[PDB]
Curated annotation (Swiss-Prot), chain D:
PANTHER family attached to this UniProt entry: 30S RIBOSOMAL PROTEIN S16, SMALL RIBOSOMAL SUBUNIT PROTEIN BS16M
Family: Belongs to the bacterial ribosomal protein bS16 family.
Biological process per Gene Ontology, one example term: translation
UniProt xrefs under SUPFAM superfamilies: Ribosomal protein S16
GO molecular function terms noted in the UniProt entry: structural constituent of ribosome
HAMAP family the record matches: Ribosomal_bS16 (MF_00385)
InterPro entries documented for this protein: Ribosomal_bS16, Ribosomal_bS16_CS, Ribosomal_bS16_dom_sf
Entry keyword Electron transport: no
Keywords associated with the record: Ribonucleoprotein, Ribosomal protein
Annotated protein name in UniProt: Small ribosomal subunit protein bS16
Organism: Escherichia coli O45:K1 (strain S88 / ExPEC)
One Pfam family, short name: Ribosomal_S16
An example Gene Ontology CC term for this record: small ribosomal subunit
Amino acid sequence: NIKSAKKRAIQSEKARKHNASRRSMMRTFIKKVYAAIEAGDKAAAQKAFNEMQPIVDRQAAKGLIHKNKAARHKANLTAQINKLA
Amino acid sequence: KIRTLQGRVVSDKMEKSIVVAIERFVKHPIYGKFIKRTTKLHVHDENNECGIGDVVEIRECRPLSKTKSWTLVRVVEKAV
Amino acid sequence: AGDEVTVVRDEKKAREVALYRQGKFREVKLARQQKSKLENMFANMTEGEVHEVNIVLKADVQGSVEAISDSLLKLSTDEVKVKIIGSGVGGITETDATLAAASNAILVGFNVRADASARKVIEAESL
Amino acid sequence: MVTIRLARHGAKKRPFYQVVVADSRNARNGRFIERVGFFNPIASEKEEGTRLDLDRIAHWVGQGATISDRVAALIKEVNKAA
Amino acid sequence: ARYLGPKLKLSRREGTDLFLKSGVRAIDTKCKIEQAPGQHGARKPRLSDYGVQLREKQKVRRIYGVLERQFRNYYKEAARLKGNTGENLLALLEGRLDNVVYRMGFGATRAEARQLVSHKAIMVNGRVVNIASYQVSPNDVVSIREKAKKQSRVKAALELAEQREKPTWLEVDAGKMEGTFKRKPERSDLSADINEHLIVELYSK
RNA sequence: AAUUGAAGAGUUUGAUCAUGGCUCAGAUUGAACGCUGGCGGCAGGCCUAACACAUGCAAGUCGAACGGUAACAGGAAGAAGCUUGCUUCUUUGCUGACGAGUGGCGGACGGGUGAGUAAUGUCUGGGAAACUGCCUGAUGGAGGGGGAUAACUACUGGAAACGGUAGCUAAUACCGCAUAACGUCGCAAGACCAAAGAGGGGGACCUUCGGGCCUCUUGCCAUCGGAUGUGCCCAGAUGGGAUUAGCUAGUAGGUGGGGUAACGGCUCACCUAGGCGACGAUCCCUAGCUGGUCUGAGAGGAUGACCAGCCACACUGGAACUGAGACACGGUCCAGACUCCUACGGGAGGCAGCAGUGGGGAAUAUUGCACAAUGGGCGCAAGCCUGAUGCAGCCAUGCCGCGUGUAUGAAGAAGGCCUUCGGGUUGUAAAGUACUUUCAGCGGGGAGGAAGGGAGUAAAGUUAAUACCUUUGCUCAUUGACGUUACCCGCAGAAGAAGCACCGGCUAACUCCGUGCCAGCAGCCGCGGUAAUACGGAGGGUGCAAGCGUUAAUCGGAAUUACUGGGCGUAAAGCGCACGCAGGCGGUUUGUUAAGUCAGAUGUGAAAUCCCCGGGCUCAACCUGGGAACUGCAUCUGAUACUGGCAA
């Protein structure tokens, strides 16, 4: 407040709005993956899986979605689709 | 030989699970009498079919659900 | 108010003078303690028709508290005697409200007002 | 992270430093892994003044520890007194 | 610190001199020796078991010239030591610098000896020492300093220095104003003068 | 070198012996009060309202990540008045820079506090299913492009705080694509994920003569490792109360889905019906804990400020973001209490940071100085910041050192006090004489805390480069906040410097006068009603000392809750008596196991600290080397008499 950390105040907000937008796209895609899994179309599930893999590792490298979470997602969402296929 | 202990059952129905009473003998520091202290532990065990009076060997493990961080290894005899 | 400030050599010596002046204020305390008993024999009131008023007073300015307290002891009659107990300077505090709770008196302050630790006594017993 | 640094436990206008390996996020007198030497400012004509086990310090430096500037000078001083 | 009173009043109360005068006179003449220490003091010699303990405590303190808190500090220090506690007590009492000055005879009295240590005249192992309660150790040379050595103060002492006691727990010169402390004082040097087996008991009353 | 450690007295009766309480002598304190107080060293100093706060300060930093001139300091060109060769004044990022701003990292550390918190915490010993900034070792890449936007300009709303509209512009900011195993996910085949440049100098090729390009330094990225740090889990131990006896629905377990960095009722859905409980659940009251400190002969008890470790909290209440790390002491949002400013429309705050103030209370401090040193933040370094820290101020609070003179001195002066009025005492004390001058007072001198860093040189290493830079030597300039430093030398002259309690018995130390069961003394039993060794006063005496005494506080003494280490016929104390479950204990013989127990070994048991042996501060206190202690615990290997288990 009193000291010059008004800079850090505006820095966290802009990065938040940036990260939230990518996290929003990340989740809307993962639910549209899990839509296909709930639907039981194994080809459309695998097509949607082939859609999410670049994006999930890309956010993992950006780091906001975080590394071991991203790997556990690719593992978990594999395990349903390769029962379906 | 990696860490293990030994006790008795007193466990009803409970799938993949057993509870295990471990008795030990401890000196009270002031008066010096040795009194038997009872450390009751919840235990995991798939294929749960130990008898109530059965006496069981035991070992530590990861949390296998809460309170259950021990696992059985061998059981001596069958009580009834 | 109305007397002399002088700059001095050292702080330690002006503790020792101040403690001598406190001894002098104790000489003025013992003077004011002796005077009341020998003026009329009694500790307070000579005749049996006794009435008094007590007040507790704090003015914001210390020159004022000493002057107007004298003018409140001026106006008194013999039959009902009015007297100050515990003249203060500045804001009303916990112990000031405690004196008029202990012995009944009216608690007044000039431009002076109550503070939180006075309010705590006042909300308990509204003097 | 570990730093080799001098901690001040001596008397008023008469220090006595204790060279020690300790974490950065802990106060000057705070937690440390082990003691490793000592430094009296008045070494004088008595037969000890600066003492520091180099087999411990070169080991911790090799594992990655950095050296405060005084201790860094004192290591290249104290040698075998060579 | 120091007593600062009539010296003979202590000597009559304690019941023998503490050597607070020259020894020309006044152990039998000026003193009223043990006759009465104060105005009603003619009329009692009876005493309690606490009083005989305290009197020897006071005798020893009034000999060595030390206060009750400091004397307690010596008793506590004698206690942690191995070997006899009474013996190490009397060793700590004898081990004072002003006491070695009194033994050398550099100061005629213990008070003049303390004056001489105070006034910066004394050197031990070539250090100067103003502190009265310095302790003199095995293989400590001790001396009065060269600069203003052997003034009228020391010179007057040296005559009665020639023939009193002069024992062997110091090496004594007094020609160039020095001494050497080799052996410690031992039990037979200073026992029976003091009830030491009693004095060591008393703090557990 | 390391086991030398333990006391009792007074008091119930006419008198005695018991029992048994009460009381005192001891040590100790973050102390207060009372009276008195010279100097020095060291240590320590709001334990009350987690009550509220004026004013100042408490973390920012990189132009060597970037637009930039808002600085302002030079230089140059040019435009100009001349001083006529220079000053002057407009331009100009040319150049040493550098505000506001953009980006990165630091803001999650240190510091303060003890409210809540009885274990989810803490301590000890173990563990498995985990992550971990910066910082290092290893192995390799560091390709090619793109779009914005604040600042800044032009408008515009505002009392102020604080903004609005529209364009323009860069980056180690942001976003695509290429590139990708030893990595992630998969059985495999495979799929997919990164990049950033910046800086110094230089021959050659050449350059839209900006640099291309070379070479050095550093940063960027991915991965396997290190050490560190943190999360997690389990056992045992770690306040009080039974006039708290029943307690638990996500409760207890399973399966599956989801969730976290990760185990996990962590959370859902569904299934099952359990879980905890006399070894004290639950509830209530009460409290930060330990290494330790204090006391104690030891065993024990009390205590947890100082110091350090850990935990918890940051006006009240709750949540999330950013980021490696926070559910964030001087960040954010919202809600609440409350406080302030105001042009009244609308805005602002969280000193349990350092100082400091109100209030509280018996009571705990200077609105100081400095980054000189140590340790930090940022940075390549310089450098800058550092109320951490180093220092100083204040206080007899504690510990400890020292002084307030020494020697001589009988006529044993006068006075005071007593006095059988013979004398005695105060008292060698004074007086007098002869001496010394510490520490003060005053005038002179002067260590160490300073090693480094900076700048200049040389070597060596490096390189296409005698370059150029670093490393490693040399040399020269320097670097003290405290500071009138510690410490030393010279001078005058006993000059400047002793008080306080107590004296019936306990308990060391006695008379006289006054008062007269009054006034008062009292910690205890008790003193005083005219001859008071106990009141008041004096004289005398004793203890202790710059302190003394009282009070409050804790342990002791107290074997007076009794493990070590107690009683219970009649003194307090055996249930009215019996049967009986849980519990405690168990004849005698053999075998066996080796839990208890006993032995050995390893690891660990933080350091400070206590103890034992040493060193250094003018000497001690204090500081400090080394050892022991580290009284415990766990695991592992052994022993088999005893107890337990098991077998006959």
